[PDB]
């Protein structure tokens, strides 16, 4: 009963529940950071829907979300941009393509998101259940500084392993390395997630409410 | 604030 | 239920990779350790004596890594431009993974292929610098995995033959070569440890830590260039360019 | 460029 301890259906429910004049600027960076701020409000309610997250001590939830929020949002907007051709779809419903990202100076990290994340997710046809599980793996990171009882966090992450793999072997029986290929997207997610944080901090030289506090 | 959105 | 044996196609891939790793990386089990006394107590910016030896050993193991890479099935059949890109992008990952395998926790030391055993302080002064505690904390995380030669070589092969590398000319072809290595590792880890299946995803996730550590390695060669008396050895320059 | 690496891969 690997799905009895970490059900992939409730993880998918956590993902589904999180899905006049033009007063919107056009500088792509401000549009990207604005959408990131209002998705941080979305991610908090997502994490509490992930099984056993709110059962951890309150500060452990604070550290876990403040540790992987960048990876957690990069994951679900790149997976949101599967059908987008050479671009990403922000949570505000606005799109950002390559040239508008190139002229903004972020084309380097943009092309890596496009080729190492969304292109990998699309050509493998990653479904929302697998995306939610990979996010639950990123959330349950025992390496985050200050966690009391990191083994409790490591145990929850390992539970997602067993249930995600059980899901991959059940619904994708002809792809035995499917569970592994899903996990192998996390190296590209961690690296771009930190390269996005250096882009973010180098930009504080427009502001948002929740985003500025997540960068304290 | 992150600490308030959690009840 | 599961078979105590391996598929003949999988067994000879594992045998091939195990032989490649052992022939290019002797285990700590068969190394006569020898120690030195250069900068054995206090941490300094850069011990030039240790840096020359460490840089020379790193040049030797890069050669061994390339010799390890050419024995992996299909690596020599990809374009040399892709082989150069794959080796360049994974060289620090392999070197760090290899030296972390030779970590003796009782003495807090690590042993190189020639037998040289340096303590944490000497490892720092040889050139590691700010990376020392991260590397030692990674080698510590490697001990409960109990990886043998086949698993260490397979994980090395998986880090090298990776399809999401930049400038790759045939990334899907590289992805196809990685698929049997992932399959070989999964069935090999879980059959040696039938009680704990989580050891396979737990072992793959250290690649994520490995690529995060090697990113800091690329941020150390930029500052090591300003502290060494001459230039980097030519092979190290070609790999980390 | 990469003339040492090229010597290794052509063998
Ligand atoms: C703020 C931010 C800035 C940037 C990026 C991503 C984000 C983030 C984000 C973007 C969009 C959404 C969303 O709409 O769901 C959520 N989070 C926080 C990760 C990338 C790396 C794409 C390119 C470079 C810049 C422009 C610096
Ligand atoms: C990034 C940094 C600090 C600067 C550039 C170099 C010097 C290339 C380097 C090399 C290693 C490394 O792991 N070398 C190894 C040398 C010999 C063996 C062996 O004998 O088995 C194993 C590993 C680590 C970090 C760095």
Short mmCIF file of C-alpha atoms and ligand atoms in Angstrom, two decimals:
data_model
loop_
_atom_site.label_atom_id
_atom_site.label_comp_id
_atom_site.label_asym_id
_atom_site.label_seq_id
_atom_site.Cartn_x
_atom_site.Cartn_y
_atom_site.Cartn_z
CA UNK A 1 0.00 0.00 0.00
CA UNK A 2 2.50 2.61 -1.17
CA UNK A 3 -0.37 4.87 -2.26
CA UNK A 4 -2.00 4.57 1.18
CA UNK A 5 0.78 6.60 2.83
CA UNK A 6 1.18 9.20 0.05
CA UNK A 7 -1.77 9.06 -2.36
CA UNK A 8 -1.08 10.44 -5.83
CA UNK A 9 -4.77 11.31 -6.20
CA UNK A 10 -4.62 13.88 -3.39
CA UNK A 11 -1.39 15.20 -4.93
CA UNK A 12 -3.19 15.63 -8.25
CA UNK A 13 -6.01 17.36 -6.36
CA UNK A 14 -3.42 19.73 -4.90
CA UNK A 15 -2.33 20.56 -8.46
CA UNK A 16 -5.84 20.93 -9.89
CA UNK A 17 -7.07 23.25 -7.13
CA UNK A 18 -4.11 25.56 -7.85
CA UNK A 19 -4.82 25.90 -11.59
CA UNK A 20 -11.57 50.29 -20.03
CA UNK A 21 -7.84 50.55 -20.70
CA UNK A 22 -4.89 48.14 -20.62
CA UNK A 23 -3.27 48.73 -17.22
CA UNK A 24 -0.49 46.16 -17.56
CA UNK A 25 3.13 47.17 -18.32
CA UNK A 26 5.18 45.62 -21.13
CA UNK A 27 8.66 45.18 -19.65
CA UNK A 28 8.75 41.35 -19.60
CA UNK A 29 10.73 41.14 -16.35
CA UNK A 30 8.09 43.05 -14.37
CA UNK A 31 5.38 40.87 -15.92
CA UNK A 32 7.30 37.73 -14.96
CA UNK A 33 7.94 38.89 -11.38
CA UNK A 34 4.35 40.09 -10.92
CA UNK A 35 2.94 36.70 -11.90
CA UNK A 36 5.48 35.03 -9.61
CA UNK A 37 4.22 37.05 -6.64
CA UNK A 38 0.57 36.01 -6.98
CA UNK A 39 1.61 32.39 -7.56
CA UNK A 40 3.43 32.45 -4.22
CA UNK A 41 0.00 32.91 -2.65
CA UNK A 42 -1.11 29.96 -4.78
CA UNK A 43 1.80 27.74 -3.73
CA UNK A 44 1.14 28.18 0.00
CA UNK A 45 -2.36 26.76 -0.43
CA UNK A 46 -0.89 24.04 -2.67
CA UNK A 47 1.63 22.87 -0.07
CA UNK A 48 -1.00 22.57 2.66
CA UNK A 49 -2.93 20.26 0.32
CA UNK A 50 0.09 18.00 -0.19
CA UNK A 51 -0.35 15.06 2.23
CA UNK A 52 1.31 15.39 5.65
CA UNK A 53 2.76 18.86 4.94
CA UNK A 54 0.68 20.77 7.52
CA UNK A 55 1.31 17.95 10.00
CA UNK A 56 4.94 19.04 10.25
CA UNK A 57 5.85 21.73 12.80
CA UNK A 58 4.88 25.20 11.62
CA UNK A 59 8.45 26.46 11.23
CA UNK A 60 9.41 23.30 9.33
CA UNK A 61 6.75 24.23 6.78
CA UNK A 62 8.11 27.78 6.67
CA UNK A 63 11.66 26.55 6.01
CA UNK A 64 10.56 23.94 3.46
CA UNK A 65 8.51 26.42 1.43
CA UNK A 66 11.08 29.22 1.69
CA UNK A 67 13.72 26.70 0.53
CA UNK A 68 12.05 25.40 -2.62
CA UNK A 69 9.55 28.08 -3.62
CA UNK A 70 11.63 29.05 -6.66
CA UNK A 71 11.92 25.45 -7.87
CA UNK A 72 8.25 24.83 -7.03
CA UNK A 73 7.03 27.71 -9.21
CA UNK A 74 9.53 27.15 -12.04
CA UNK A 75 8.24 23.58 -12.30
CA UNK A 76 4.54 24.35 -12.69
CA UNK A 77 4.91 27.30 -15.06
CA UNK A 78 7.28 25.37 -17.32
CA UNK A 79 4.82 22.46 -17.32
CA UNK A 80 2.12 25.07 -17.96
CA UNK A 81 4.03 26.12 -21.10
CA UNK A 82 4.06 22.68 -22.76
CA UNK A 83 1.92 23.74 -25.72
CA UNK A 84 3.59 27.17 -25.97
CA UNK A 85 5.97 27.40 -28.94
CA UNK A 86 9.32 28.91 -27.87
CA UNK A 87 7.93 30.69 -24.83
CA UNK A 88 6.24 30.42 -21.45
CA UNK A 89 2.71 31.18 -20.25
CA UNK A 90 2.69 33.24 -17.07
CA UNK A 91 0.01 32.75 -14.43
CA UNK A 92 -1.48 36.13 -15.38
CA UNK A 93 -2.41 34.68 -18.78
CA UNK A 94 0.35 36.64 -20.53
CA UNK A 95 3.01 35.06 -22.74
CA UNK A 96 6.74 35.72 -23.01
CA UNK A 97 8.61 34.48 -26.09
CA UNK A 98 12.30 34.16 -26.91
CA UNK A 99 13.06 37.55 -28.48
CA UNK A 100 11.16 39.48 -25.81
CA UNK A 101 13.26 37.51 -23.32
CA UNK A 102 16.43 38.01 -25.38
CA UNK A 103 15.97 41.79 -25.62
CA UNK A 104 15.31 41.81 -21.85
CA UNK A 105 18.73 40.25 -21.24
CA UNK A 106 17.45 37.01 -19.68
CA UNK A 107 17.53 34.95 -22.89
CA UNK A 108 20.36 32.74 -21.62
CA UNK A 109 18.45 31.37 -18.63
CA UNK A 110 15.29 31.55 -20.75
CA UNK A 111 16.69 29.24 -23.43
CA UNK A 112 17.73 26.76 -20.74
CA UNK A 113 14.28 26.69 -19.20
CA UNK A 114 12.91 26.19 -22.70
CA UNK A 115 15.30 23.36 -23.62
CA UNK A 116 16.00 21.63 -20.28
CA UNK A 117 12.55 21.89 -18.71
CA UNK A 118 9.47 22.47 -20.85
CA UNK A 119 10.93 20.77 -23.94
CA UNK A 120 11.90 17.80 -21.77
CA UNK A 121 8.48 17.79 -20.10
CA UNK A 122 6.58 18.06 -23.39
CA UNK A 123 8.48 15.47 -25.44
CA UNK A 124 7.99 13.03 -22.54
CA UNK A 125 4.33 14.10 -22.04
CA UNK A 126 4.55 14.57 -18.28
CA UNK A 127 1.06 14.58 -16.78
CA UNK A 128 -0.10 16.69 -13.84
CA UNK A 129 0.09 13.75 -11.41
CA UNK A 130 3.79 13.28 -12.16
CA UNK A 131 4.36 17.05 -11.94
CA UNK A 132 2.70 17.26 -8.53
CA UNK A 133 4.79 14.35 -7.28
CA UNK A 134 8.03 15.97 -8.47
CA UNK A 135 6.98 19.17 -6.71
CA UNK A 136 6.18 17.21 -3.55
CA UNK A 137 9.71 15.80 -3.81
CA UNK A 138 11.12 19.32 -4.09
CA UNK A 139 8.99 20.48 -1.15
CA UNK A 140 10.07 17.63 1.16
CA UNK A 141 13.73 18.61 1.06
CA UNK A 142 15.49 17.49 4.28
CA UNK A 143 18.62 19.49 3.38
CA UNK A 144 16.97 22.83 4.18
CA UNK A 145 18.79 24.72 6.94
CA UNK A 146 17.24 24.64 10.39
CA UNK A 147 14.79 21.78 9.94
CA UNK A 148 13.92 20.03 13.20
CA UNK A 149 13.84 16.27 12.58
CA UNK A 150 15.01 16.19 8.95
CA UNK A 151 14.42 12.42 8.86
CA UNK A 152 10.69 13.17 9.11
CA UNK A 153 11.06 15.26 5.94
CA UNK A 154 13.25 12.63 4.28
CA UNK A 155 10.61 9.99 5.04
CA UNK A 156 7.86 12.02 3.36
CA UNK A 157 10.03 12.54 0.28
CA UNK A 158 10.75 8.81 0.08
CA UNK A 159 7.01 8.15 0.29
CA UNK A 160 6.51 10.24 -2.85
CA UNK A 161 9.20 8.12 -4.54
CA UNK A 162 7.28 4.89 -3.93
CA UNK A 163 3.91 6.33 -4.95
CA UNK A 164 5.25 8.20 -7.98
CA UNK A 165 7.07 5.09 -9.19
CA UNK A 166 3.98 2.96 -8.54
CA UNK A 167 2.06 5.48 -10.66
CA UNK A 168 4.64 5.42 -13.47
CA UNK A 169 4.74 1.62 -13.59
CA UNK A 170 0.93 1.44 -13.49
CA UNK A 171 -0.07 3.98 -16.14
CA UNK A 172 3.12 3.86 -18.26
CA UNK A 173 3.94 0.13 -18.32
CA UNK A 174 5.91 0.29 -21.59
CA UNK A 175 8.31 2.92 -20.15
CA UNK A 176 10.34 1.24 -17.38
CA UNK A 177 12.76 4.16 -17.04
CA UNK A 178 9.89 6.63 -16.79
CA UNK A 179 10.21 7.12 -13.02
CA UNK A 180 13.95 7.70 -13.43
CA UNK A 181 13.59 10.11 -16.36
CA UNK A 182 11.15 12.13 -14.25
CA UNK A 183 13.63 12.36 -11.37
CA UNK A 184 16.42 13.31 -13.80
CA UNK A 185 14.65 16.63 -14.43
CA UNK A 186 15.46 17.80 -10.87
CA UNK A 187 19.17 18.45 -11.64
CA UNK A 188 18.15 20.94 -14.34
CA UNK A 189 15.47 22.35 -12.03
CA UNK A 190 17.84 23.00 -9.11
CA UNK A 191 20.50 24.62 -11.31
CA UNK A 192 18.16 27.02 -13.12
CA UNK A 193 16.34 27.67 -9.86
CA UNK A 194 19.52 29.15 -8.38
CA UNK A 195 20.47 30.94 -11.60
CA UNK A 196 17.02 32.51 -11.39
CA UNK A 197 17.74 33.70 -7.84
CA UNK A 198 20.92 35.48 -8.96
CA UNK A 199 18.94 37.09 -11.77
CA UNK A 200 16.33 38.13 -9.20
CA UNK A 201 18.72 39.69 -6.68
CA UNK A 202 20.72 41.40 -9.43
CA UNK A 203 17.44 43.08 -10.43
CA UNK A 204 17.02 44.88 -7.09
CA UNK A 205 19.63 47.38 -8.30
CA UNK A 206 9.99 47.01 -9.54
CA UNK A 207 8.86 45.33 -6.31
CA UNK A 208 6.21 42.82 -5.27
CA UNK A 209 4.75 42.05 -1.85
CA UNK A 210 5.28 38.30 -1.33
CA UNK A 211 8.24 38.04 -3.73
CA UNK A 212 10.32 40.64 -1.88
CA UNK A 213 9.78 38.80 1.42
CA UNK A 214 10.74 35.46 -0.14
CA UNK A 215 14.05 37.15 -1.05
CA UNK A 216 14.78 38.55 2.43
CA UNK B 1 3.95 37.18 5.13
CA UNK B 2 4.65 33.45 4.86
CA UNK B 3 4.12 32.86 8.59
CA UNK B 4 0.56 34.25 8.54
CA UNK B 5 -0.79 32.41 5.48
CA UNK B 6 -0.36 29.23 7.56
CA UNK B 7 -2.99 29.09 10.31
CA UNK C 1 8.45 -12.07 -6.59
CA UNK C 2 11.72 -11.33 -8.38
CA UNK C 3 14.51 -13.35 -9.98
CA UNK C 4 17.78 -13.55 -8.05
CA UNK C 5 19.64 -13.26 -11.39
CA UNK C 6 19.97 -10.50 -13.99
CA UNK C 7 18.86 -10.36 -17.61
CA UNK C 8 21.80 -11.46 -19.81
CA UNK C 9 21.62 -8.19 -21.75
CA UNK C 10 21.68 -6.22 -18.49
CA UNK C 11 24.35 -8.34 -16.80
CA UNK C 12 26.95 -7.69 -19.49
CA UNK C 13 26.21 -3.96 -19.52
CA UNK C 14 26.78 -3.94 -15.76
CA UNK C 15 29.85 -6.14 -16.17
CA UNK C 16 31.13 -3.80 -18.89
CA UNK C 17 30.62 -0.69 -16.74
CA UNK C 18 32.04 -2.35 -13.61
CA UNK C 19 35.16 -3.39 -15.52
CA UNK C 20 35.55 0.10 -16.99
CA UNK C 21 35.38 1.73 -13.55
CA UNK C 22 37.78 -0.72 -11.89
CA UNK C 23 40.33 -0.55 -14.72
CA UNK C 24 40.26 3.28 -14.62
CA UNK C 25 39.77 3.81 -10.87
CA UNK C 26 41.35 1.44 -8.35
CA UNK C 27 39.36 1.00 -5.17
CA UNK C 28 40.50 2.11 -1.73
CA UNK C 29 40.54 -1.62 -0.91
CA UNK C 30 43.73 -2.12 -2.96
CA UNK C 31 45.68 1.10 -2.35
CA UNK C 32 48.73 1.51 -0.14
CA UNK C 33 48.04 4.88 1.45
CA UNK C 34 50.87 7.35 1.98
CA UNK C 35 50.57 10.68 3.78
CA UNK C 36 52.44 13.98 3.66
CA UNK C 37 52.98 16.83 6.13
CA UNK C 38 52.52 19.91 3.92
CA UNK C 39 49.96 22.16 5.65
CA UNK C 40 48.68 19.40 7.92
CA UNK C 41 47.25 21.60 10.70
CA UNK C 42 46.28 25.13 9.63
CA UNK C 43 44.24 26.11 6.58
CA UNK C 44 46.01 28.51 4.19
CA UNK C 45 44.94 30.18 0.95
CA UNK C 46 46.83 27.74 -1.28
CA UNK C 47 49.67 25.30 -0.58
CA UNK C 48 51.70 25.39 -3.79
CA UNK C 49 53.35 22.06 -2.97
CA UNK C 50 49.98 20.35 -2.54
CA UNK C 51 48.48 22.19 -5.53
CA UNK C 52 51.13 20.86 -7.93
CA UNK C 53 50.57 17.28 -6.79
CA UNK C 54 46.78 17.67 -6.68
CA UNK C 55 46.67 19.29 -10.13
CA UNK C 56 48.84 16.48 -11.50
CA UNK C 57 46.61 13.80 -9.95
CA UNK C 58 43.55 15.59 -11.35
CA UNK C 59 45.12 15.55 -14.82
CA UNK C 60 45.73 11.81 -14.47
CA UNK C 61 42.16 11.01 -13.41
CA UNK C 62 40.69 13.13 -16.21
CA UNK C 63 42.65 10.87 -18.56
CA UNK C 64 41.23 7.88 -16.70
CA UNK C 65 37.72 9.33 -16.92
CA UNK C 66 38.08 9.68 -20.70
CA UNK C 67 39.37 6.10 -20.86
CA UNK C 68 36.40 5.12 -18.70
CA UNK C 69 34.06 7.02 -21.04
CA UNK C 70 35.30 5.40 -24.25
CA UNK C 71 34.52 1.93 -22.88
CA UNK C 72 30.88 2.82 -22.20
CA UNK C 73 28.73 1.25 -24.96
CA UNK C 74 27.94 3.75 -27.69
CA UNK C 75 29.97 6.68 -26.34
CA UNK C 76 32.60 6.34 -29.07
CA UNK C 77 29.83 6.10 -31.69
CA UNK C 78 28.54 9.60 -30.97
CA UNK C 79 30.12 12.57 -32.72
CA UNK C 80 33.42 13.64 -31.18
CA UNK C 81 31.90 17.11 -30.74
CA UNK C 82 29.25 15.51 -28.51
CA UNK C 83 31.85 13.38 -26.71
CA UNK C 84 33.85 16.52 -25.93
CA UNK C 85 30.72 18.35 -24.75
CA UNK C 86 29.62 15.44 -22.56
CA UNK C 87 33.05 14.99 -20.95
CA UNK C 88 33.53 18.73 -20.41
CA UNK C 89 30.11 19.11 -18.78
CA UNK C 90 30.52 16.09 -16.47
CA UNK C 91 34.27 16.07 -15.73
CA UNK C 92 33.99 17.80 -12.34
CA UNK C 93 31.03 15.57 -11.46
CA UNK C 94 33.03 12.39 -12.09
CA UNK C 95 36.22 13.58 -10.38
CA UNK C 96 34.34 14.68 -7.26
CA UNK C 97 32.26 11.48 -7.18
CA UNK C 98 35.43 9.41 -7.57
CA UNK C 99 37.46 11.06 -4.81
CA UNK C 100 34.42 10.97 -2.50
CA UNK C 101 34.38 7.18 -2.95
CA UNK C 102 37.83 7.01 -1.32
CA UNK C 103 36.74 8.81 1.87
CA UNK C 104 37.82 7.13 5.11
CA UNK C 105 35.43 8.43 7.80
CA UNK C 106 37.55 7.33 10.77
CA UNK C 107 40.48 9.59 9.85
CA UNK C 108 38.48 12.23 7.91
CA UNK C 109 40.72 11.75 4.88
CA UNK C 110 40.42 11.00 1.17
CA UNK C 111 42.80 8.91 -0.92
CA UNK C 112 43.87 9.52 -4.51
CA UNK C 113 44.61 6.87 -7.13
CA UNK C 114 48.35 6.94 -6.36
CA UNK C 115 47.59 6.30 -2.68
CA UNK C 116 48.08 9.87 -1.44
CA UNK C 117 45.87 10.36 1.61
CA UNK C 118 45.19 13.95 2.69
CA UNK C 119 43.22 15.11 5.70
CA UNK C 120 40.47 17.71 5.40
CA UNK C 121 42.95 20.52 6.06
CA UNK C 122 45.37 19.33 3.38
CA UNK C 123 42.47 18.78 0.97
CA UNK C 124 41.51 22.42 1.56
CA UNK C 125 45.05 23.72 1.08
CA UNK C 126 45.64 21.64 -2.06
CA UNK C 127 43.12 23.79 -3.94
CA UNK C 128 39.63 22.80 -2.81
CA UNK C 129 39.30 25.85 -0.58
CA UNK C 130 35.67 26.85 0.04
CA UNK C 131 34.52 23.54 -1.50
CA UNK C 132 36.17 21.34 1.14
CA UNK C 133 33.32 21.13 3.65
CA UNK C 134 30.73 20.67 0.90
CA UNK C 135 32.74 17.84 -0.69
CA UNK C 136 33.39 16.15 2.66
CA UNK C 137 29.71 16.48 3.57
CA UNK C 138 28.88 14.86 0.21
CA UNK C 139 31.32 11.98 0.75
CA UNK C 140 29.69 11.44 4.15
CA UNK C 141 26.25 11.23 2.51
CA UNK C 142 27.67 8.54 0.19
CA UNK C 143 28.51 6.04 2.94
CA UNK C 144 24.99 4.72 3.81
CA UNK C 145 24.44 4.00 0.09
CA UNK C 146 27.14 1.27 0.21
CA UNK C 147 27.87 1.65 -3.50
CA UNK C 148 30.15 -0.94 -5.07
CA UNK C 149 32.19 -0.61 -8.27
CA UNK C 150 29.25 -1.33 -10.57
CA UNK C 151 26.98 1.26 -8.93
CA UNK C 152 29.71 3.92 -8.79
CA UNK C 153 30.58 3.37 -12.45
CA UNK C 154 26.92 3.30 -13.48
CA UNK C 155 26.19 6.56 -11.66
CA UNK C 156 29.32 8.02 -13.28
CA UNK C 157 28.09 6.82 -16.67
CA UNK C 158 24.66 8.34 -16.03
CA UNK C 159 26.15 11.74 -15.14
CA UNK C 160 28.29 11.74 -18.30
CA UNK C 161 25.78 10.42 -20.86
CA UNK C 162 23.11 13.02 -20.13
CA UNK C 163 20.86 14.40 -22.86
CA UNK C 164 20.04 17.80 -21.34
CA UNK C 165 23.52 19.21 -21.91
CA UNK C 166 23.98 22.44 -23.83
CA UNK C 167 25.43 22.53 -27.36
CA UNK C 168 24.64 18.83 -27.85
CA UNK C 169 24.24 18.06 -31.55
CA UNK C 170 22.26 14.82 -31.07
CA UNK C 171 20.66 15.07 -27.61
CA UNK C 172 18.00 12.42 -28.25
CA UNK C 173 20.72 9.98 -29.34
CA UNK C 174 22.52 10.66 -26.05
CA UNK C 175 19.24 10.13 -24.20
CA UNK C 176 18.91 6.68 -25.79
CA UNK C 177 22.36 5.65 -24.56
CA UNK C 178 21.45 6.74 -21.02
CA UNK C 179 18.27 4.64 -20.91
CA UNK C 180 19.88 1.18 -20.44
CA UNK C 181 22.26 2.60 -17.83
CA UNK C 182 19.27 3.81 -15.81
CA UNK C 183 17.62 0.41 -16.27
CA UNK C 184 20.82 -1.44 -15.33
CA UNK C 185 21.27 0.63 -12.17
CA UNK C 186 17.64 0.28 -11.03
CA UNK C 187 17.58 -3.52 -11.23
CA UNK C 188 21.11 -3.82 -9.81
CA UNK C 189 20.58 -1.59 -6.76
CA UNK C 190 17.23 -3.14 -5.81
CA UNK C 191 18.40 -6.75 -6.19
CA UNK C 192 21.46 -6.22 -3.97
CA UNK C 193 19.20 -4.40 -1.46
CA UNK C 194 15.83 -6.18 -1.78
CA UNK C 195 14.67 -4.79 1.58
CA UNK C 196 15.02 -1.06 0.78
CA UNK C 197 13.79 -0.12 -2.72
CA UNK C 198 14.15 3.60 -1.96
CA UNK C 199 17.92 3.26 -2.42
CA UNK C 200 17.57 3.70 -6.19
CA UNK C 201 15.79 7.10 -6.19
CA UNK C 202 17.97 8.10 -3.24
CA UNK C 203 21.08 7.29 -5.29
CA UNK C 204 19.92 9.17 -8.39
CA UNK C 205 19.15 12.29 -6.34
CA UNK C 206 22.82 12.70 -5.39
CA UNK C 207 23.38 13.54 -9.07
CA UNK C 208 21.35 16.67 -8.30
CA UNK C 209 23.66 17.40 -5.37
CA UNK C 210 26.65 16.48 -7.54
CA UNK C 211 25.68 18.97 -10.25
CA UNK C 212 25.10 21.63 -7.60
CA UNK C 213 28.56 20.97 -6.15
CA UNK C 214 30.27 20.94 -9.56
CA UNK C 215 28.69 24.33 -10.27
CA UNK C 216 30.67 25.65 -7.31
CA UNK C 217 33.71 23.89 -8.75
CA UNK C 218 33.45 26.02 -11.88
CA UNK C 219 33.33 28.99 -9.49
CA UNK C 220 36.57 27.79 -7.87
CA UNK C 221 38.69 27.46 -11.02
CA UNK C 222 37.92 31.12 -11.76
CA UNK C 223 39.53 32.10 -8.44
CA UNK C 224 42.15 29.33 -8.42
CA UNK C 225 43.57 30.87 -11.62
CA UNK C 226 44.34 34.06 -9.66
CA UNK C 227 46.11 32.24 -6.80
CA UNK C 228 48.29 29.61 -8.53
CA UNK C 229 51.77 30.75 -9.64
CA UNK C 230 51.43 29.68 -13.27
CA UNK C 231 48.52 28.51 -15.40
CA UNK C 232 46.26 25.49 -15.15
CA UNK C 233 47.51 22.23 -16.66
CA UNK C 234 46.50 22.07 -20.34
CA UNK C 235 44.05 19.18 -19.93
CA UNK C 236 42.34 20.91 -17.00
CA UNK C 237 42.07 24.04 -19.16
CA UNK C 238 40.49 22.06 -22.00
CA UNK C 239 37.92 20.37 -19.74
CA UNK C 240 36.95 23.44 -17.70
CA UNK C 241 36.85 26.06 -20.47
CA UNK D 1 41.67 23.67 -29.39
CA UNK D 2 41.03 20.59 -27.23
CA UNK D 3 44.06 18.96 -28.86
CA UNK D 4 44.79 16.83 -25.78
CA UNK D 5 41.14 15.78 -25.53
CA UNK D 6 41.09 15.00 -29.26
CA UNK D 7 44.15 12.77 -28.85
CA UNK D 8 42.26 10.80 -26.19
CA UNK D 9 39.05 10.25 -28.17
CA UNK D 10 40.56 9.21 -31.52
CA UNK D 11 42.47 6.29 -29.96
C1 LIG E 1 10.51 35.85 -10.83
C2 LIG E 1 11.15 35.05 -12.00
C3 LIG E 1 12.06 35.71 -12.83
C4 LIG E 1 12.67 35.03 -13.90
C5 LIG E 1 12.35 33.67 -14.14
C6 LIG E 1 11.43 33.01 -13.32
C7 LIG E 1 10.83 33.68 -12.24
C8 LIG E 1 9.81 32.87 -11.37
C9 LIG E 1 8.35 32.58 -11.79
C10 LIG E 1 7.92 32.94 -13.06
C11 LIG E 1 6.65 32.68 -13.45
C12 LIG E 1 5.79 32.07 -12.58
C13 LIG E 1 4.35 31.78 -13.01
O1 LIG E 1 3.73 32.59 -13.76
O2 LIG E 1 3.78 30.72 -12.61
C14 LIG E 1 6.22 31.71 -11.31
N1 LIG E 1 7.50 31.97 -10.93
C15 LIG E 1 9.84 32.66 -9.84
C16 LIG E 1 10.38 31.58 -10.76
C17 LIG E 1 13.03 32.92 -15.36
C18 LIG E 1 14.03 31.89 -14.77
C19 LIG E 1 11.90 32.20 -16.13
C20 LIG E 1 13.77 33.75 -16.37
C21 LIG E 1 14.53 34.92 -15.77
C22 LIG E 1 13.70 35.76 -14.84
C23 LIG E 1 12.93 36.81 -15.68
C24 LIG E 1 14.69 36.52 -13.91
C1 LIG E 2 37.27 22.57 -9.10
C2 LIG E 2 38.64 22.23 -8.52
C3 LIG E 2 38.71 22.80 -7.10
C4 LIG E 2 39.67 22.94 -9.32
C5 LIG E 2 40.06 22.18 -10.57
C6 LIG E 2 40.49 20.79 -10.29
C7 LIG E 2 41.92 20.86 -9.77
C8 LIG E 2 40.43 20.02 -11.61
C9 LIG E 2 39.64 19.98 -9.24
C10 LIG E 2 39.76 18.60 -9.14
C11 LIG E 2 38.98 17.91 -8.20
C12 LIG E 2 39.11 16.40 -8.05
O1 LIG E 2 38.21 15.77 -7.62
N1 LIG E 2 40.39 15.81 -8.43
C13 LIG E 2 40.75 14.41 -8.33
C14 LIG E 2 42.09 14.09 -8.52
C15 LIG E 2 42.51 12.78 -8.41
C16 LIG E 2 41.60 11.78 -8.11
C17 LIG E 2 42.21 10.39 -8.02
O2 LIG E 2 43.46 10.25 -7.96
O3 LIG E 2 41.46 9.37 -7.98
C18 LIG E 2 40.27 12.09 -7.91
C19 LIG E 2 39.84 13.41 -8.02
C20 LIG E 2 38.10 18.61 -7.35
C21 LIG E 2 37.99 19.99 -7.45
C22 LIG E 2 38.75 20.68 -8.39
#
